[PDB]
Amino acid sequence: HMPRVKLGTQGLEVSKLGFGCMGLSGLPEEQGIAVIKEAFNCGITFFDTSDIYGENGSNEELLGKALKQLPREKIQVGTKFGIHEIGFSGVKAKGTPDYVRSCCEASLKRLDVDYIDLFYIHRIDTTVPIEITMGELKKLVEEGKIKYVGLSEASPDTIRRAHAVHPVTALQIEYSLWTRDIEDEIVPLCRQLGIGIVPYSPIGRGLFAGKAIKESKNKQIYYRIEALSQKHGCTPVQLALAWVLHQGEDVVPIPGTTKIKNLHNNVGALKVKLTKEDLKEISDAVPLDEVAGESIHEVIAVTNWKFANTPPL
Protein backbone atom coordinates (compact mmCIF):
# COMPACT_ATOMS: atom_id res chain seq x y z
CA HIS A 1 0.00 0.00 0.00
CA MET A 2 1.07 3.65 0.22
CA PRO A 3 4.49 3.98 1.82
CA ARG A 4 4.76 6.64 4.50
CA VAL A 5 7.69 8.95 5.14
CA LYS A 6 9.06 11.30 7.83
CA LEU A 7 8.90 14.80 6.43
CA GLY A 8 11.47 16.97 8.11
CA THR A 9 12.82 16.09 11.56
CA GLN A 10 10.16 17.36 13.97
CA GLY A 11 7.69 14.42 13.83
CA LEU A 12 5.61 15.03 10.72
CA GLU A 13 4.80 11.85 8.79
CA VAL A 14 3.15 11.88 5.45
CA SER A 15 2.16 9.52 2.64
CA LYS A 16 5.03 9.26 0.13
CA LEU A 17 2.70 10.97 -2.31
CA GLY A 18 0.67 14.01 -1.33
CA PHE A 19 -2.25 15.60 -3.10
CA GLY A 20 -2.49 19.23 -4.33
CA CYS A 21 -5.97 20.66 -3.91
CA MET A 22 -5.46 23.87 -5.97
CA GLY A 23 -7.03 22.68 -9.23
CA LEU A 24 -10.24 21.58 -7.49
CA SER A 25 -11.41 25.25 -7.43
CA GLY A 26 -10.56 26.74 -10.85
CA LEU A 27 -15.12 22.82 -10.77
CA PRO A 28 -18.25 21.33 -8.98
CA GLU A 29 -17.96 20.93 -5.24
CA GLU A 30 -19.35 17.50 -4.68
CA GLN A 31 -17.00 16.11 -7.32
CA GLY A 32 -14.13 17.96 -5.62
CA ILE A 33 -14.91 16.13 -2.42
CA ALA A 34 -15.03 12.78 -4.23
CA VAL A 35 -11.57 13.39 -5.70
CA ILE A 36 -10.35 13.96 -2.18
CA LYS A 37 -12.12 10.87 -0.67
CA GLU A 38 -10.80 8.80 -3.56
CA ALA A 39 -7.23 10.04 -2.91
CA PHE A 40 -7.45 9.14 0.73
CA ASN A 41 -8.80 5.70 -0.29
CA CYS A 42 -5.63 5.21 -2.35
CA GLY A 43 -3.61 5.92 0.81
CA ILE A 44 -2.89 9.63 0.34
CA THR A 45 -3.22 11.35 3.70
CA PHE A 46 -1.26 14.54 2.98
CA PHE A 47 -3.38 17.30 1.39
CA ASP A 48 -2.05 20.67 0.25
CA THR A 49 -4.04 23.93 -0.02
CA SER A 50 -3.63 27.70 0.64
CA ASP A 51 -5.73 30.68 1.69
CA ILE A 52 -5.13 32.12 -1.75
CA TYR A 53 -6.63 29.28 -3.79
CA GLY A 54 -10.15 29.59 -5.07
CA GLU A 55 -12.26 32.59 -4.21
CA ASN A 56 -12.17 33.89 -0.63
CA GLY A 57 -10.55 30.66 0.45
CA SER A 58 -13.06 28.40 -1.27
CA ASN A 59 -10.29 25.81 -1.77
CA GLU A 60 -9.74 25.54 2.01
CA GLU A 61 -13.52 25.39 2.51
CA LEU A 62 -13.75 22.58 -0.01
CA LEU A 63 -11.02 20.58 1.78
CA GLY A 64 -12.57 21.28 5.15
CA LYS A 65 -15.73 19.75 3.72
CA ALA A 66 -13.90 16.67 2.47
CA LEU A 67 -12.40 16.23 5.95
CA LYS A 68 -15.90 16.11 7.51
CA GLN A 69 -16.32 12.81 5.68
CA LEU A 70 -12.89 11.58 6.72
CA PRO A 71 -10.89 10.57 9.77
CA ARG A 72 -9.03 13.90 10.16
CA GLU A 73 -6.70 12.54 12.83
CA LYS A 74 -5.24 10.38 10.01
CA ILE A 75 -4.83 13.25 7.60
CA GLN A 76 -2.03 15.77 7.37
CA VAL A 77 -3.34 19.15 6.31
CA GLY A 78 -0.91 21.61 4.65
CA THR A 79 -2.08 25.17 4.16
CA LYS A 80 -0.36 28.53 3.65
CA PHE A 81 -0.56 32.24 4.20
CA GLY A 82 1.34 35.23 2.98
CA ILE A 83 0.17 36.09 -0.46
CA HIS A 84 -1.66 39.31 0.24
CA GLU A 85 -2.34 40.70 -3.20
CA ILE A 86 -2.00 39.34 -6.71
CA GLY A 87 -1.61 42.10 -9.26
CA PHE A 88 -1.17 42.06 -12.99
CA SER A 89 2.47 40.95 -13.27
CA GLY A 90 3.43 40.59 -9.65
CA VAL A 91 2.58 39.24 -6.25
CA LYS A 92 2.61 41.13 -2.93
CA ALA A 93 3.72 39.13 0.10
CA LYS A 94 2.90 39.99 3.68
CA GLY A 95 4.64 38.52 6.71
CA THR A 96 3.89 40.80 9.68
CA PRO A 97 3.04 38.80 12.81
CA ASP A 98 -0.50 40.19 12.94
CA TYR A 99 -1.12 38.91 9.43
CA VAL A 100 0.39 35.57 10.26
CA ARG A 101 -2.00 35.21 13.17
CA SER A 102 -5.09 36.40 11.40
CA CYS A 103 -4.40 34.28 8.30
CA CYS A 104 -3.90 31.24 10.53
CA GLU A 105 -7.09 31.75 12.49
CA ALA A 106 -8.95 32.41 9.29
CA SER A 107 -7.70 29.18 7.67
CA LEU A 108 -8.65 27.26 10.82
CA LYS A 109 -12.27 28.39 10.46
CA ARG A 110 -12.51 27.89 6.68
CA LEU A 111 -11.03 24.38 7.10
CA ASP A 112 -13.12 23.81 10.24
CA VAL A 113 -10.31 22.08 12.12
CA ASP A 114 -8.74 22.78 15.52
CA TYR A 115 -5.19 22.73 14.20
CA ILE A 116 -3.23 22.65 10.97
CA ASP A 117 -0.49 20.07 10.62
CA LEU A 118 1.77 22.04 8.34
CA PHE A 119 1.37 25.75 7.76
CA TYR A 120 3.67 27.46 5.23
CA ILE A 121 4.84 30.93 4.40
CA HIS A 122 3.61 30.88 0.80
CA ARG A 123 5.74 33.80 -0.44
CA ILE A 124 8.56 35.52 1.37
CA ASP A 125 7.80 39.08 2.44
CA THR A 126 10.97 40.88 1.33
CA THR A 127 10.37 43.87 3.67
CA VAL A 128 10.31 41.95 6.93
CA PRO A 129 13.11 39.98 8.54
CA ILE A 130 12.18 36.31 8.28
CA GLU A 131 13.03 35.97 11.98
CA ILE A 132 10.01 38.07 12.85
CA THR A 133 7.55 36.03 10.75
CA MET A 134 9.03 32.79 12.10
CA GLY A 135 8.57 34.16 15.60
CA GLU A 136 4.80 34.28 15.30
CA LEU A 137 4.76 30.84 13.69
CA LYS A 138 6.83 29.56 16.63
CA LYS A 139 3.97 30.90 18.86
CA LEU A 140 1.27 29.29 16.78
CA VAL A 141 3.15 26.05 17.24
CA GLU A 142 3.28 26.32 21.04
CA GLU A 143 -0.41 27.24 21.18
CA GLY A 144 -1.10 24.11 19.17
CA LYS A 145 -2.79 26.06 16.37
CA ILE A 146 -0.24 24.53 14.03
CA LYS A 147 2.14 21.58 14.42
CA TYR A 148 4.85 22.22 11.86
CA VAL A 149 6.21 25.09 9.80
CA GLY A 150 7.00 25.13 6.09
CA LEU A 151 8.55 27.63 3.70
CA SER A 152 7.69 28.02 0.05
CA GLU A 153 9.96 29.53 -2.61
CA ALA A 154 12.62 30.73 -0.13
CA SER A 155 16.22 31.68 -0.75
CA PRO A 156 18.96 29.82 1.11
CA ASP A 157 19.45 32.91 3.35
CA THR A 158 15.77 32.98 4.33
CA ILE A 159 15.86 29.21 4.85
CA ARG A 160 18.90 29.28 7.21
CA ARG A 161 17.60 32.26 9.06
CA ALA A 162 14.08 30.84 9.44
CA HIS A 163 15.39 27.52 10.63
CA ALA A 164 17.47 29.09 13.42
CA VAL A 165 14.35 30.64 14.96
CA HIS A 166 12.14 27.44 14.83
CA PRO A 167 12.85 24.25 12.85
CA VAL A 168 11.41 24.17 9.34
CA THR A 169 9.66 20.86 8.56
CA ALA A 170 9.40 21.33 4.76
CA LEU A 171 10.23 23.52 1.81
CA GLN A 172 7.75 23.47 -1.06
CA ILE A 173 9.34 24.53 -4.29
CA GLU A 174 9.23 23.86 -8.02
CA TYR A 175 11.27 20.74 -8.88
CA SER A 176 10.89 18.34 -11.79
CA LEU A 177 12.83 16.81 -14.64
CA TRP A 178 12.44 20.15 -16.39
CA THR A 179 13.36 22.45 -13.50
CA ARG A 180 16.25 21.42 -11.32
CA ASP A 181 17.83 24.70 -10.24
CA ILE A 182 17.34 23.77 -6.54
CA GLU A 183 19.90 20.91 -6.83
CA ASP A 184 22.90 23.25 -6.70
CA GLU A 185 22.32 24.84 -3.32
CA ILE A 186 18.79 24.45 -2.03
CA VAL A 187 18.68 20.67 -1.76
CA PRO A 188 22.03 20.10 -0.03
CA LEU A 189 21.02 22.88 2.39
CA CYS A 190 17.68 21.14 3.14
CA ARG A 191 19.59 17.94 3.65
CA GLN A 192 22.00 19.69 5.99
CA LEU A 193 19.26 21.21 8.11
CA GLY A 194 16.99 18.13 8.05
CA ILE A 195 14.25 19.91 6.09
CA GLY A 196 11.85 17.88 3.97
CA ILE A 197 11.42 18.79 0.31
CA VAL A 198 7.88 19.10 -1.22
CA PRO A 199 8.20 19.48 -4.97
CA TYR A 200 5.49 20.71 -7.18
CA SER A 201 4.99 21.55 -10.85
CA PRO A 202 2.74 24.54 -11.02
CA ILE A 203 -0.25 24.29 -13.32
CA GLY A 204 0.31 26.11 -16.58
CA ARG A 205 -2.27 28.91 -16.46
CA GLY A 206 -1.82 32.61 -15.82
CA LEU A 207 -2.33 36.10 -17.10
CA PHE A 208 -0.31 37.78 -19.79
CA ALA A 209 -0.78 41.39 -20.82
CA GLY A 210 -4.14 41.22 -19.09
CA LYS A 211 -5.29 38.12 -21.08
CA ALA A 212 -6.07 34.63 -19.81
CA ILE A 213 -3.34 32.25 -20.92
CA LYS A 214 -2.74 28.52 -20.85
CA GLU A 215 0.32 26.61 -21.99
CA SER A 216 0.48 24.63 -25.24
CA LYS A 217 14.14 19.15 -33.57
CA ASN A 218 12.07 18.88 -30.32
CA LYS A 219 9.85 15.81 -30.85
CA GLN A 220 13.14 13.86 -30.77
CA ILE A 221 13.20 14.68 -27.03
CA TYR A 222 9.60 13.52 -26.43
CA TYR A 223 10.48 10.27 -28.13
CA ARG A 224 13.45 9.77 -25.79
CA ILE A 225 11.04 10.12 -22.86
CA GLU A 226 8.16 8.08 -24.16
CA ALA A 227 10.59 5.35 -25.12
CA LEU A 228 12.02 5.30 -21.57
CA SER A 229 8.58 5.32 -20.04
CA GLN A 230 7.55 2.44 -22.27
CA LYS A 231 10.69 0.70 -21.21
CA HIS A 232 9.73 1.24 -17.56
CA GLY A 233 6.16 -0.03 -18.05
CA CYS A 234 4.64 3.39 -17.33
CA THR A 235 3.35 6.58 -18.95
CA PRO A 236 5.56 9.67 -19.52
CA VAL A 237 3.55 11.39 -16.79
CA GLN A 238 4.36 8.58 -14.41
CA LEU A 239 7.95 8.47 -15.45
CA ALA A 240 8.40 12.15 -14.59
CA LEU A 241 6.75 11.59 -11.23
CA ALA A 242 8.88 8.51 -10.61
CA TRP A 243 12.08 10.47 -11.30
CA VAL A 244 11.03 13.00 -8.61
CA LEU A 245 10.08 10.29 -6.14
CA HIS A 246 13.49 8.71 -6.60
CA GLN A 247 15.44 11.88 -5.74
CA GLY A 248 15.30 11.05 -2.05
CA GLU A 249 13.50 9.57 0.93
CA ASP A 250 12.90 13.19 2.06
CA VAL A 251 11.13 14.12 -1.20
CA VAL A 252 7.23 14.24 -1.17
CA PRO A 253 5.64 15.52 -4.38
CA ILE A 254 2.07 16.72 -4.25
CA PRO A 255 0.60 16.48 -7.72
CA GLY A 256 -2.98 17.65 -8.18
CA THR A 257 -5.66 16.66 -10.65
CA THR A 258 -9.38 17.16 -11.06
CA LYS A 259 -9.79 13.61 -12.40
CA ILE A 260 -9.92 10.28 -10.60
CA LYS A 261 -8.15 8.63 -13.49
CA ASN A 262 -5.15 10.98 -13.40
CA LEU A 263 -5.12 10.49 -9.63
CA HIS A 264 -4.84 6.72 -10.10
CA ASN A 265 -2.17 7.21 -12.68
CA ASN A 266 -0.17 9.31 -10.19
CA VAL A 267 -0.51 6.69 -7.52
CA GLY A 268 0.63 4.13 -10.05
CA ALA A 269 3.95 5.97 -10.32
CA LEU A 270 4.96 4.54 -6.96
CA LYS A 271 5.24 1.01 -8.46
CA VAL A 272 7.98 2.15 -10.84
CA LYS A 273 11.41 1.36 -9.46
CA LEU A 274 14.57 2.90 -10.95
CA THR A 275 18.25 2.04 -10.51
CA LYS A 276 20.88 4.75 -10.21
CA GLU A 277 21.57 4.06 -13.89
CA ASP A 278 17.94 4.19 -15.04
CA LEU A 279 17.71 7.64 -13.37
CA LYS A 280 20.78 9.17 -14.95
CA GLU A 281 19.43 7.89 -18.29
CA ILE A 282 16.22 9.72 -17.60
CA SER A 283 17.99 12.89 -16.34
CA ASP A 284 20.16 12.88 -19.52
CA ALA A 285 17.20 12.60 -21.86
CA VAL A 286 16.13 16.10 -20.80
CA PRO A 287 18.39 19.15 -21.33
CA LEU A 288 18.79 21.63 -18.50
CA ASP A 289 17.82 25.28 -18.96
CA GLU A 290 20.53 27.47 -20.48
CA VAL A 291 20.23 30.02 -17.67
CA ALA A 292 19.49 28.67 -14.22
CA GLY A 293 15.91 29.46 -13.34
CA GLU A 294 14.94 31.03 -16.64
CA SER A 295 12.63 28.88 -18.73
CA ILE A 296 10.97 29.62 -22.06
CA HIS A 297 7.28 28.85 -22.48
CA GLU A 298 4.84 29.08 -25.34
CA VAL A 299 1.37 30.09 -24.24
CA ILE A 300 -1.94 30.82 -25.91
CA ALA A 301 -3.75 33.96 -24.99
CA VAL A 302 -7.43 34.67 -25.59
CA THR A 303 -9.12 38.08 -25.84
CA ASN A 304 -11.30 39.35 -23.01
CA TRP A 305 -14.29 40.67 -24.89
CA LYS A 306 -15.62 37.56 -26.70
CA PHE A 307 -17.69 36.47 -23.67
CA ALA A 308 -17.81 39.70 -21.68
CA ASN A 309 -21.65 39.42 -21.73
CA THR A 310 -24.18 40.00 -19.00
CA PRO A 311 -27.39 38.32 -17.86
CA PRO A 312 -30.38 39.80 -19.62
CA LEU A 313 -33.16 41.45 -17.69
Place this chain on the structure above:
Amino acid sequence: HMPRVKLGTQGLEVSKLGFGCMGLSGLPEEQGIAVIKEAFNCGITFFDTSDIYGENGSNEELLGKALKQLPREKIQVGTKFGIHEIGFSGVKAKGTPDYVRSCCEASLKRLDVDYIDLFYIHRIDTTVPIEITMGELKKLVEEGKIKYVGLSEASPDTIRRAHAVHPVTALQIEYSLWTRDIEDEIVPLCRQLGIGIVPYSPIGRGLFAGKAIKESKNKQIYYRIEALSQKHGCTPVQLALAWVLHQGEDVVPIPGTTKIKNLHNNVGALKVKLTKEDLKEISDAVPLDEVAGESIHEVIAVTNWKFANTPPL
Protein backbone atom coordinates in the same frame (compact mmCIF):
# COMPACT_ATOMS: atom_id res chain seq x y z
CA HIS B 1 0.97 70.73 -33.39
CA MET B 2 -1.11 67.91 -31.87
CA PRO B 3 -4.36 67.44 -33.76
CA ARG B 4 -7.44 67.12 -31.59
CA VAL B 5 -10.41 64.83 -32.16
CA LYS B 6 -14.01 64.34 -30.99
CA LEU B 7 -14.13 61.06 -29.11
CA GLY B 8 -17.62 59.65 -29.21
CA THR B 9 -20.62 61.91 -29.79
CA GLN B 10 -21.34 63.44 -26.38
CA GLY B 11 -18.78 66.30 -26.39
CA LEU B 12 -15.51 64.70 -25.34
CA GLU B 13 -12.48 66.05 -27.23
CA VAL B 14 -9.08 64.57 -26.92
CA SER B 15 -5.61 64.86 -28.42
CA LYS B 16 -5.29 62.50 -31.39
CA LEU B 17 -2.76 60.61 -29.30
CA GLY B 18 -3.41 59.79 -25.67
CA PHE B 19 -0.99 58.61 -23.02
CA GLY B 20 -1.23 55.39 -20.96
CA CYS B 21 -0.06 55.87 -17.39
CA MET B 22 0.04 52.16 -16.37
CA GLY B 23 3.76 51.56 -16.85
CA LEU B 24 4.70 54.54 -14.66
CA SER B 25 4.03 52.41 -11.53
CA GLY B 26 5.54 48.95 -12.19
CA LEU B 27 9.48 53.38 -11.20
CA PRO B 28 10.47 56.65 -9.30
CA GLU B 29 7.68 59.12 -8.73
CA GLU B 30 9.28 62.38 -9.64
CA GLN B 31 10.38 60.91 -12.97
CA GLY B 32 6.83 59.63 -13.49
CA ILE B 33 5.56 63.16 -13.14
CA ALA B 34 8.15 64.45 -15.61
CA VAL B 35 7.04 61.89 -18.20
CA ILE B 36 3.54 63.22 -17.77
CA LYS B 37 4.53 66.95 -17.95
CA GLU B 38 6.66 66.17 -20.99
CA ALA B 39 3.69 64.43 -22.69
CA PHE B 40 1.44 67.37 -22.07
CA ASN B 41 4.19 69.66 -23.46
CA CYS B 42 4.08 67.61 -26.69
CA GLY B 43 0.33 68.33 -26.86
CA ILE B 44 -1.05 65.17 -25.25
CA THR B 45 -3.96 66.13 -23.02
CA PHE B 46 -5.68 62.74 -22.71
CA PHE B 47 -4.27 60.57 -19.90
CA ASP B 48 -5.38 57.02 -19.13
CA THR B 49 -5.21 55.27 -15.73
CA SER B 50 -7.27 52.86 -13.54
CA ASP B 51 -7.90 52.15 -9.87
CA ILE B 52 -6.21 48.81 -10.38
CA TYR B 53 -2.83 50.09 -11.59
CA GLY B 54 0.01 50.34 -9.14
CA GLU B 55 -0.48 49.50 -5.51
CA ASN B 56 -3.64 50.74 -3.79
CA GLY B 57 -4.22 53.11 -6.66
CA SER B 58 -0.71 54.54 -6.67
CA ASN B 59 -1.00 55.08 -10.44
CA GLU B 60 -4.01 57.40 -9.97
CA GLU B 61 -2.17 59.16 -7.12
CA LEU B 62 0.82 59.67 -9.38
CA LEU B 63 -1.35 61.21 -12.13
CA GLY B 64 -3.21 63.33 -9.61
CA LYS B 65 0.21 64.65 -8.61
CA ALA B 66 1.17 65.42 -12.20
CA LEU B 67 -2.10 67.32 -12.62
CA LYS B 68 -1.22 69.61 -9.67
CA GLN B 69 1.55 70.96 -11.88
CA LEU B 70 -0.75 71.25 -14.89
CA PRO B 71 -3.78 73.12 -16.14
CA ARG B 72 -6.32 70.35 -15.37
CA GLU B 73 -9.14 72.13 -17.19
CA LYS B 74 -7.12 71.41 -20.37
CA ILE B 75 -6.59 67.75 -19.58
CA GLN B 76 -8.92 64.84 -20.17
CA VAL B 77 -8.59 62.27 -17.42
CA GLY B 78 -9.62 58.65 -18.18
CA THR B 79 -9.86 56.26 -15.26
CA LYS B 80 -11.65 52.96 -14.61
CA PHE B 81 -13.27 50.75 -12.04
CA GLY B 82 -14.51 47.22 -11.95
CA ILE B 83 -11.60 44.92 -11.51
CA HIS B 84 -12.21 43.73 -7.99
CA GLU B 85 -9.77 40.88 -7.59
CA ILE B 86 -6.89 39.57 -9.64
CA GLY B 87 -6.21 35.91 -8.95
CA PHE B 88 -3.69 33.50 -10.34
CA SER B 89 -5.17 32.82 -13.79
CA GLY B 90 -8.27 34.95 -13.72
CA VAL B 91 -9.82 38.29 -12.97
CA LYS B 92 -12.96 38.98 -10.91
CA ALA B 93 -15.13 41.86 -12.12
CA LYS B 94 -17.61 43.74 -9.98
CA GLY B 95 -20.32 46.02 -11.34
CA THR B 96 -22.90 46.50 -8.56
CA PRO B 97 -24.02 50.12 -8.29
CA ASP B 98 -22.58 50.48 -4.78
CA TYR B 99 -19.17 49.45 -6.08
CA VAL B 100 -19.47 51.78 -9.02
CA ARG B 101 -20.13 54.67 -6.66
CA SER B 102 -17.48 53.84 -4.14
CA CYS B 103 -14.83 53.19 -6.81
CA CYS B 104 -15.68 56.53 -8.42
CA GLU B 105 -15.48 58.50 -5.21
CA ALA B 106 -12.29 56.74 -4.32
CA SER B 107 -10.66 57.58 -7.67
CA LEU B 108 -11.76 61.19 -7.27
CA LYS B 109 -9.83 61.46 -4.00
CA ARG B 110 -6.72 59.58 -5.18
CA LEU B 111 -6.63 61.79 -8.31
CA ASP B 112 -7.56 64.86 -6.24
CA VAL B 113 -9.94 66.24 -8.85
CA ASP B 114 -13.60 67.28 -8.65
CA TYR B 115 -14.64 65.24 -11.67
CA ILE B 116 -13.34 62.62 -14.06
CA ASP B 117 -13.73 63.26 -17.77
CA LEU B 118 -14.04 59.66 -18.87
CA PHE B 119 -14.70 56.83 -16.45
CA TYR B 120 -14.75 53.25 -17.81
CA ILE B 121 -16.03 49.88 -16.78
CA HIS B 122 -12.65 48.15 -16.90
CA ARG B 123 -13.99 44.58 -17.03
CA ILE B 124 -17.55 43.46 -17.56
CA ASP B 125 -19.17 41.87 -14.52
CA THR B 126 -20.80 38.80 -16.07
CA THR B 127 -23.25 38.34 -13.14
CA VAL B 128 -24.95 41.72 -13.37
CA PRO B 129 -27.04 43.10 -16.20
CA ILE B 130 -25.02 45.86 -17.83
CA GLU B 131 -28.12 48.07 -17.64
CA ILE B 132 -27.78 48.19 -13.88
CA THR B 133 -24.09 49.21 -13.89
CA MET B 134 -24.79 51.80 -16.60
CA GLY B 135 -27.59 53.15 -14.45
CA GLU B 136 -25.26 54.21 -11.67
CA LEU B 137 -22.83 55.67 -14.19
CA LYS B 138 -25.73 57.65 -15.70
CA LYS B 139 -26.23 59.08 -12.14
CA LEU B 140 -22.57 59.90 -11.71
CA VAL B 141 -22.83 61.80 -14.96
CA GLU B 142 -25.81 63.89 -13.84
CA GLU B 143 -24.13 64.64 -10.50
CA GLY B 144 -21.14 65.86 -12.46
CA LYS B 145 -18.80 63.37 -10.80
CA ILE B 146 -17.98 62.11 -14.28
CA LYS B 147 -18.58 63.59 -17.73
CA TYR B 148 -18.47 60.60 -20.06
CA VAL B 149 -18.74 56.83 -19.87
CA GLY B 150 -16.46 54.25 -21.46
CA LEU B 151 -16.47 50.47 -21.74
CA SER B 152 -13.41 48.25 -21.88
CA GLU B 153 -13.28 44.75 -23.37
CA ALA B 154 -17.07 44.48 -23.91
CA SER B 155 -19.00 42.16 -26.17
CA PRO B 156 -21.28 43.63 -28.82
CA ASP B 157 -24.32 42.66 -26.67
CA THR B 158 -22.96 44.51 -23.63
CA ILE B 159 -22.06 47.46 -25.86
CA ARG B 160 -25.57 47.78 -27.41
CA ARG B 161 -27.25 47.27 -24.11
CA ALA B 162 -25.02 49.75 -22.27
CA HIS B 163 -25.47 52.36 -24.94
CA ALA B 164 -29.27 52.23 -24.74
CA VAL B 165 -29.18 53.19 -21.06
CA HIS B 166 -26.68 56.15 -21.43
CA PRO B 167 -24.49 56.94 -24.45
CA VAL B 168 -21.05 55.35 -24.41
CA THR B 169 -18.29 57.83 -25.36
CA ALA B 170 -15.50 55.26 -25.94
CA LEU B 171 -14.57 51.61 -26.03
CA GLN B 172 -11.02 50.77 -25.02
CA ILE B 173 -9.91 47.47 -26.44
CA GLU B 174 -6.85 45.70 -27.81
CA TYR B 175 -6.27 46.64 -31.48
CA SER B 176 -3.05 46.69 -33.47
CA LEU B 177 -1.51 45.33 -36.63
CA TRP B 178 -1.18 42.05 -34.78
CA THR B 179 -4.66 41.87 -33.25
CA ARG B 180 -7.56 42.90 -35.42
CA ASP B 181 -10.43 40.70 -34.27
CA ILE B 182 -12.55 43.79 -33.45
CA GLU B 183 -12.78 44.72 -37.18
CA ASP B 184 -15.43 42.09 -37.92
CA GLU B 185 -18.17 43.25 -35.59
CA ILE B 186 -16.95 45.56 -32.86
CA VAL B 187 -15.75 48.43 -35.02
CA PRO B 188 -18.75 48.71 -37.36
CA LEU B 189 -20.94 48.59 -34.24
CA CYS B 190 -18.97 51.46 -32.63
CA ARG B 191 -19.31 53.35 -35.86
CA GLN B 192 -23.04 52.69 -35.92
CA LEU B 193 -23.58 53.90 -32.37
CA GLY B 194 -21.14 56.84 -32.61
CA ILE B 195 -18.76 55.35 -30.03
CA GLY B 196 -15.09 56.34 -30.08
CA ILE B 197 -12.47 53.61 -30.22
CA VAL B 198 -9.42 53.71 -27.84
CA PRO B 199 -6.96 51.03 -28.89
CA TYR B 200 -4.21 49.76 -26.74
CA SER B 201 -1.52 47.10 -26.87
CA PRO B 202 -1.16 45.68 -23.43
CA ILE B 203 2.34 45.51 -22.01
CA GLY B 204 3.78 42.03 -22.21
CA ARG B 205 4.18 41.04 -18.55
CA GLY B 206 2.13 38.67 -16.44
CA LEU B 207 2.13 35.59 -14.27
CA PHE B 208 2.37 32.04 -15.49
CA ALA B 209 2.12 29.03 -13.22
CA GLY B 210 2.82 31.40 -10.35
CA LYS B 211 6.05 32.78 -11.95
CA ALA B 212 6.80 36.30 -13.16
CA ILE B 213 6.90 36.32 -16.95
CA LYS B 214 7.83 38.79 -19.66
CA GLU B 215 7.60 38.35 -23.41
CA SER B 216 10.61 37.70 -25.65
CA LYS B 217 10.91 31.61 -41.42
CA ASN B 218 9.79 34.53 -39.15
CA LYS B 219 12.53 37.16 -39.54
CA GLN B 220 11.28 37.42 -43.14
CA ILE B 221 8.20 39.11 -41.65
CA TYR B 222 10.22 41.58 -39.53
CA TYR B 223 12.13 42.51 -42.65
CA ARG B 224 8.88 43.25 -44.51
CA ILE B 225 7.96 45.65 -41.69
CA GLU B 226 11.30 47.32 -41.17
CA ALA B 227 11.59 47.79 -44.92
CA LEU B 228 8.16 49.50 -45.01
CA SER B 229 8.99 51.64 -42.03
CA GLN B 230 12.25 52.67 -43.66
CA LYS B 231 10.29 53.44 -46.75
CA HIS B 232 7.95 55.63 -44.70
CA GLY B 233 10.80 57.49 -42.97
CA CYS B 234 9.92 56.07 -39.55
CA THR B 235 10.73 53.27 -37.09
CA PRO B 236 8.79 49.96 -36.99
CA VAL B 237 7.31 51.14 -33.69
CA GLN B 238 6.09 54.29 -35.35
CA LEU B 239 4.84 52.46 -38.37
CA ALA B 240 2.64 50.23 -36.20
CA LEU B 241 1.30 53.26 -34.39
CA ALA B 242 0.71 55.07 -37.68
CA TRP B 243 -1.31 52.13 -39.04
CA VAL B 244 -3.59 52.36 -35.96
CA LEU B 245 -3.91 56.13 -36.24
CA HIS B 246 -4.96 55.75 -39.86
CA GLN B 247 -7.84 53.34 -39.12
CA GLY B 248 -10.20 56.24 -38.49
CA GLU B 249 -10.84 59.75 -37.24
CA ASP B 250 -12.62 58.10 -34.26
CA VAL B 251 -9.53 56.08 -33.29
CA VAL B 252 -7.36 57.39 -30.33
CA PRO B 253 -4.53 55.09 -29.26
CA ILE B 254 -3.01 55.59 -25.84
CA PRO B 255 0.48 54.15 -25.87
CA GLY B 256 2.46 54.32 -22.63
CA THR B 257 6.17 54.45 -21.95
CA THR B 258 8.42 55.17 -19.00
CA LYS B 259 10.91 57.00 -21.24
CA ILE B 260 10.83 60.50 -22.69
CA LYS B 261 12.54 59.27 -25.81
CA ASN B 262 9.93 56.59 -26.56
CA LEU B 263 7.29 59.24 -25.84
CA HIS B 264 8.82 61.52 -28.49
CA ASN B 265 9.02 58.63 -30.88
CA ASN B 266 5.30 57.97 -30.38
CA VAL B 267 4.45 61.58 -31.00
CA GLY B 268 6.58 61.43 -34.11
CA ALA B 269 4.22 58.79 -35.51
CA LEU B 270 1.66 61.50 -36.21
CA LYS B 271 3.87 62.97 -39.00
CA VAL B 272 3.65 59.73 -40.99
CA LYS B 273 0.95 59.92 -43.62
CA LEU B 274 -0.30 56.80 -45.43
CA THR B 275 -2.42 56.37 -48.55
CA LYS B 276 -5.11 53.71 -48.75
CA GLU B 277 -2.54 51.69 -50.71
CA ASP B 278 0.34 52.18 -48.26
CA LEU B 279 -1.99 50.86 -45.52
CA LYS B 280 -3.11 47.71 -47.28
CA GLU B 281 0.57 47.05 -48.00
CA ILE B 282 1.26 47.32 -44.31
CA SER B 283 -1.81 45.23 -43.33
CA ASP B 284 -0.70 42.52 -45.82
CA ALA B 285 2.82 42.33 -44.45
CA VAL B 286 1.41 40.89 -41.22
CA PRO B 287 -0.57 37.61 -41.17
CA LEU B 288 -3.78 37.46 -39.16
CA ASP B 289 -4.18 34.94 -36.33
CA GLU B 290 -5.38 31.51 -37.41
CA VAL B 291 -8.19 31.53 -34.85
CA ALA B 292 -9.85 34.86 -34.17
CA GLY B 293 -8.73 36.11 -30.79
CA GLU B 294 -6.28 33.33 -30.03
CA SER B 295 -2.66 34.38 -30.22
CA ILE B 296 0.49 32.41 -29.46
CA HIS B 297 3.19 34.00 -27.32
CA GLU B 298 6.62 32.95 -26.17
CA VAL B 299 7.42 34.15 -22.68
CA ILE B 300 10.30 33.78 -20.25
CA ALA B 301 9.54 32.77 -16.72
CA VAL B 302 11.84 33.21 -13.74
CA THR B 303 11.78 31.25 -10.46
CA ASN B 304 10.47 32.86 -7.29
CA TRP B 305 13.11 31.84 -4.79
CA LYS B 306 16.31 33.39 -6.21
CA PHE B 307 15.65 36.75 -4.51
CA ALA B 308 13.09 35.74 -1.89
CA ASN B 309 15.42 37.27 0.76
CA THR B 310 14.64 39.44 3.75
CA PRO B 311 16.23 42.46 5.41
CA PRO B 312 18.73 41.39 8.04
CA LEU B 313 18.29 42.40 11.64
